[PDB]
Amino acid sequence: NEVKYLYLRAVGGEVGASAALAPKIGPLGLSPKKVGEDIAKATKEFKGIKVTVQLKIQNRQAAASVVPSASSLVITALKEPPRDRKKDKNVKHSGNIQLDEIIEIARQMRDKSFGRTLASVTKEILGTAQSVGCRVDFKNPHDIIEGINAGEIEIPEN
Amino acid sequence: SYADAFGPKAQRKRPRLAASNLEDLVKATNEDITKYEEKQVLDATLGLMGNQEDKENGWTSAAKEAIF
Amino acid sequence: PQNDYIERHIKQHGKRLDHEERKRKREARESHKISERAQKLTGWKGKQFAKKRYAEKVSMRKKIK
Amino acid sequence: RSKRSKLVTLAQTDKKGRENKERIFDEVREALDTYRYVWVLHLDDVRTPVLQEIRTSWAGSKLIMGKRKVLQKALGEKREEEYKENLYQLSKLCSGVTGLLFTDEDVNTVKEYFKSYVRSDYSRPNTKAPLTFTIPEGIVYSRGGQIPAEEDVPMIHSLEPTMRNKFEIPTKIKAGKITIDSPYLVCTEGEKLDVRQALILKQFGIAASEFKVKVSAYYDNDSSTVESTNINME
Amino acid sequence: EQVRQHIGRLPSIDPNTRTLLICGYPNVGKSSFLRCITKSDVDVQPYAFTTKSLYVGHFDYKYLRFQAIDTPGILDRPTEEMNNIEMQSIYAIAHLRSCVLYFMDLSEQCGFTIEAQVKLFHSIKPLFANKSVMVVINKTDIIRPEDLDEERAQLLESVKEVPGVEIMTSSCQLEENVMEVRNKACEKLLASRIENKLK
Amino acid sequence: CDTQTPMHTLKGHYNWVLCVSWSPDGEVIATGSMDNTIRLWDPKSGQCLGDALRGHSKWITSLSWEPIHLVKPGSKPRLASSSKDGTIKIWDTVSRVCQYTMSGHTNSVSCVKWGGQGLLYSGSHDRTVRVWDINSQGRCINILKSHAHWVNHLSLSTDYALRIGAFDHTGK
RNA sequence: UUCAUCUAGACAGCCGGACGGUGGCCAUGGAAGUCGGAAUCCGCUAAGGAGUGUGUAACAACUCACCGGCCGAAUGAACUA
Numbered sequence A: 001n002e003v004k005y006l007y008l009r010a011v012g013g014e015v016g017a018s019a020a021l022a023p024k025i026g027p028l029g030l031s032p033k034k035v036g037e038d039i040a041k042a043t044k045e046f047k048g049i050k051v052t053v054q055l056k057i058q059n060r061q062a063a064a065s066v067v068p069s070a071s072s073l074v075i076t077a078l079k080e081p082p083r084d085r086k087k088d089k090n091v092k093h094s095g096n097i098q099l100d101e102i103i104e105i106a107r108q109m110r111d112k113s114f115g116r117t118l119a120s121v122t123k124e125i126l127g128t129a130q131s132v133g134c135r136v137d138f139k140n141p142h143d144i145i146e147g148i149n150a151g152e153i154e155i156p157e158n
Numbered sequence B: 001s002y003a004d005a006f007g008p009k010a011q012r013k014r015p016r017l018a019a020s021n022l023e024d025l026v027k028a029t030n031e032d033i034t035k036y037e038e039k040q041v042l043d044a045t046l047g048l049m050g051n052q053e054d055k056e057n058g059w060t061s062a063a064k065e066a067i068f
Numbered sequence C: 001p002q003n004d005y006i007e008r009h010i011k012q013h014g015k016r017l018d019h020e021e022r023k024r025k026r027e028a029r030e031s032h033k034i035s036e037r038a039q040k041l042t043g044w045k046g047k048q049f050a051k052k053r054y055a056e057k058v059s060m061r062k063k064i065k
Numbered sequence D: 001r002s003k004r005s006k007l008v009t010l011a012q013t014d015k016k017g018r019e020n021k022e023r024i025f026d027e028v029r030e031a032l033d034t035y036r037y038v039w040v041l042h043l044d045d046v047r048t049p050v051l052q053e054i055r056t057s058w059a060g061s062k063l064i065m066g067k068r069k070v071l072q073k074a075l076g077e078k079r080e081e082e083y084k085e086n087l088y089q090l091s092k093l094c095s096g097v098t099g100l101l102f103t104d105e106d107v108n109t110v111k112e113y114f115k116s117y118v119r120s121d122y123s124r125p126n127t128k129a130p131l132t133f134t135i136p137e138g139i140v141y142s143r144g145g146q147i148p149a150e151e152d153v154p155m156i157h158s159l160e161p162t163m164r165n166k167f168e169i170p171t172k173i174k175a176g177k178i179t180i181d182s183p184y185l186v187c188t189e190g191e192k193l194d195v196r197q198a199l200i201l202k203q204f205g206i207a208a209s210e211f212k213v214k215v216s217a218y219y220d221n222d223s224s225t226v227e228s229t230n231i232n233m234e
Numbered sequence E: 001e002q003v004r005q006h007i008g009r010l011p012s013i014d015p016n017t018r019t020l021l022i023c024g025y026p027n028v029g030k031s032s033f034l035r036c037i038t039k040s041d042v043d044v045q046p047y048a049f050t051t052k053s054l055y056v057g058h059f060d061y062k063y064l065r066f067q068a069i070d071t072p073g074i075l076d077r078p079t080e081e082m083n084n085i086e087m088q089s090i091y092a093i094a095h096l097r098s099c100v101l102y103f104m105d106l107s108e109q110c111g112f113t114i115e116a117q118v119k120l121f122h123s124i125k126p127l128f129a130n131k132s133v134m135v136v137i138n139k140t141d142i143i144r145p146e147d148l149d150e151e152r153a154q155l156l157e158s159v160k161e162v163p164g165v166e167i168m169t170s171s172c173q174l175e176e177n178v179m180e181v182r183n184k185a186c187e188k189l190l191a192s193r194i195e196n197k198l199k
Numbered sequence F: 001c002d003t004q005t006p007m008h009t010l011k012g013h014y015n016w017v018l019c020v021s022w023s024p025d026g027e028v029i030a031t032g033s034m035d036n037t038i039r040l041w042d043p044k045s046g047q048c049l050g051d052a053l054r055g056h057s058k059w060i061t062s063l064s065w066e067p068i069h070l071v072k073p074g075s076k077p078r079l080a081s082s083s084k085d086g087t088i089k090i091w092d093t094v095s096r097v098c099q100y101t102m103s104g105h106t107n108s109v110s111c112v113k114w115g116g117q118g119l120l121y122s123g124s125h126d127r128t129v130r131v132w133d134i135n136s137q138g139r140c141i142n143i144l145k146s147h148a149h150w151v152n153h154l155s156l157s158t159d160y161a162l163r164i165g166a167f168d169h170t171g172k
Numbered sequence G: 001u002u003c004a005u006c007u008a009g010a011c012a013g014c015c016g017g018a019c020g021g022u023g024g025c026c027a028u029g030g031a032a033g034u035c036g037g038a039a040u041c042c043g044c045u046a047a048g049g050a051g052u053g054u055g056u057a058a059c060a061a062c063u064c065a066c067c068g069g070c071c072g073a074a075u076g077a078a079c080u081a
């Protein structure tokens, strides 16, 4: 047999998120109901957070996994309450994430990065945090990056 | 603005005053249809029996005299 | 025809076979044509052409700045 | 008057001046003192992800690219201008897109890695054809028959002028789908490829050629000698 | 100027002539059915909201001219979060006294479950008052209503419970079936109009 | 006001001081400025309490205090602030931190008011008034949409009582 | 006339590269640099915009901003008469 890989972006926890997979599923002949059920089952950890889903199709199967992404991990570490599309809109991500949680996200995202140092991976995660608009250690993430460059902040793992 | 209302750079995507529900929407549309039909009958009493029918035969009223 | 029928026709049948080349050659000739218009137009049309050229140059310099 | 008018673009990136070349010069001349082995690598038509993977694999070492003339000037053009003894041979052996690998690891390990490193790559012009490609008759699909048409998506209609004019392929638009009257042979296996055929293969997404780094020679700091490696120079 | 250019290309719809409205979820076969029964050039593509505006076709049944209207898809959302593209279909259904055909896909290749389609039908139920209603099950070449699950059959029976709708099966590759459903819709519309005019 | 003379000068901010407010128990003066900052002051000494409150990206528009009758005894009232960026931030001054950042508005928030039933009302330039709950992690309970333009101001029936706190007209 | 670039490579041309976090956040039926609103960062580089345009329903694909290879000697811009 051969392994087919599909990648998508979906809101975690929402069943029936395989509607946009119809051109992909069609020639493959799978069941969109079961595909969406498996996607929600694999994305049960993230509730109301957009995450990357990898679908493996081999023979007649459908396996769902969550690819870790910088934005999704930062939003998860932000620990926002779950939101509904009927009630909440235009929500800003301006919570607080500690530097230890940022370093944990950098450890999770280190494997698929070309940064030779965990300091470099952490600086990338802090750039993503600056993009999403949150605060790290009650300061600007770019200020944290400047502190790392100047030597005030030392990344533990070397 | 007009640019946001309509055109290549429009940003309006939902009605400004959305209907409360489909029942109110259908009641409003039925009332509007009834008013439109009554108005059409009221103008068909006079204007359609007058000006509209004359152009079918090509008849035109004579020029108004300047003595008036 | 209804709605965006010309765009649908372009999507379903394409354009004329020499459309891209002809448009590229016309846009290439545009500089010569502008110079010839500036040197050939007389009277009110020439004055208006010079005025519009000045306004376009001012707008371009402001955009660059 | 009567001169060409330069196109003006409003972008974010400026051109690099002499300061970038001087920085590369200083970095090369400092790496010469820092490290022990200096390897010459030929990396023509390398992809940036492949180069970054090579840089990641060679952690603890340095890989420096840039202008060949600048690198040769940093290494010393002649015997009276060389930065270190017997560096003119290493400078003169450079060619094309040349990378300098400053390292301290074992020569056998470096040779083993560069002999066993291989990646799939697009088939470049002036190279032997890796396969025989024939676009099948009928509706043209994105892969062009490499995968089954039931799985494949039809070729987008916006590419039809490109295939008709740049690729010189007789194509027509039927109901928004690109169609050909007869099967079109693109390349025959065991034939030198040109720019048009390489572009056709790249457009259809066939990556059958193999990219291997070429290793010219290396210089040893303490030995003050240069030895030819002759790896992937076939 | 922009409004003039757009409004010059709007299709001509007579709100007082014989009309067959086609409605339902996206990717169910509305445009395909319009292509089957008319000569309109509406696009048929396997993604949602290929059709962003009303499309009109015409045909002749019993020496009479009928117009068929293809509408953009409708989602199961309240009117407050409903958008303009759906509002076109909603206004067409509310205004055009006609024969409405609600299309359902049982294979769920449209991306919407049978429960969601039944819910959407029951949500747009107040729209078609004093209009002919028919429920057309499309893509019967993939899966038939006969070999459906028991709970889904109960949902279909719940749809059929609403008076005075009729459930008919069709496939857009079945010329005979699309002609039969078109003729049945025309018969219902003609019966309603003649009964209204007779009073 | 007894001698009509200046008593203290507060010179912490860098830009225009857009709004000033007094704590309902009369203990701390809050100043929200044009530089997206809020500063707390002891009035008896004319001094600044710690560092400024930061987190807003645009200038502060209005300030409101938690009602004393809702504040538990032994605790200090919290401070809600609205700003041009469209967010309402809640600050606990005991730890000098920020608890909640309501962000439902799509335009500049004109005013924020903290009612006596544990609710907050925000009027903004997006023609909407948002009703939030302090007891539900700062969630938007309701959205009121009836205006065709920017809502400039809002007021409550018990606003005078909420502002006055436990004091009366006799100054007891 | 005054500024600049230049055999550790002048202007044009051709070819190659144009990366990774990442499909950055909000919003949308859909919006992945390129319908919109605000940020516009970090890493690896020789260089590569959270993107100059074409293009897609969204992707894809092309392009140029920039860098490199071939070519080898002058060239560009703004003013004045």
Ligand SMILES: Nc1nc2c(ncn2[C@@H]2O[C@H](COP(=O)(O)OP(=O)(O)O)[C@@H](O)[C@H]2O)c(=O)[nH]1
Pocket (backbone or CB within 6 Å): E025, E026, E027, E028, E029, E030, E031, E032, E033, E043, E044, E045, E046, E047, E048, E049, E050, E051, E138, E139, E140, E141, E142, E170, E171, E172, E173
């Ligand atoms: N097998 C099958 N496929 C259909 C049928 N009707 C429509 N389709 C498919 O459904 C896809 C989209 O349908 P479409 O006509 O656009 O439905 P609409 O979105 O409601 O207008 C197309 O790719 C068709 O191939 C049918 O009767 N049988």
Ligand SMILES: [Mg+2]
Pocket (backbone or CB within 6 Å): E030, E031, E032, E043, E044, E050, E051
């Ligand atoms: Mg359609």
